[PDB]
Specification:
It is classed as transport protein. The chain is mainly β. It has one helix at about 75-80, and strands at about 10-20, 30-35, 40-45, 55, 70-75, 90-95, 105-110, 120. The strands form two sheets. Strands 4-1-7-8 form a four-stranded mixed sheet, with no helix packed on it. Strands 3-2-5-6 form a four-stranded antiparallel sheet, with no helix packed on it. The radius of gyration is 15 Å and the shape is globular.
Length: about 130
């Protein structure tokens, strides 16, 4: 298929790949927040990617609750490694959850400052 490749432990796998290099970014500062009761975003998890571009071990299933969550990727850290023109600062995306469970999915995101952005999100059965 187009998406869904690779194993993981966390309930949500984040893959940070480069659209200009066509390879996974290393040491990609990523953060995960959750929608609070004050229409704000609280700290949920955070971590960096590896040579594989995969980032797991953020949180557990007992801590991973339902609700909306916002993810922030620091591409600048990866752009400074080679010295690429930092067209933008960081990439922030919001994901709404309706129900958790098995059959975890992985989010494939591509980094492209020059060309149009590229991101892929997968949905699970909550019916």
């Amino acid at each position: 298929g187009p998406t869904g490749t690779g194993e993981s432990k966390c309930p949500l796998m984040v893959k940070v790949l480069d659209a200009v290099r066509g390879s996974p970014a290393i040491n990609v500062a990523v953060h995960v927040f959750r929608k609070a009761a004050d229409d704000t975003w609280e700290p949920f998890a955070s971590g960096k990617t590896s040579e594989s571009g995969e980032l797991h071990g953020l949180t557990t299933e007992e801590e991973f609750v339902e609700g909306i969550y916002k993810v922030e990727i620091d591409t600048k850290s990866y752009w400074k490694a080679l010295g690429i023109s930092p067209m933008h600062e960081h990439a922030e995306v919001v994901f709404t959850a309706n129900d958790s469970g098995p059959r975890r999915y992985t989010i494939a995101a591509m980094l492209s400052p020059y060309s149009y952005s590229t991101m892929a999100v997968v949905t699970n059965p909550k019916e």
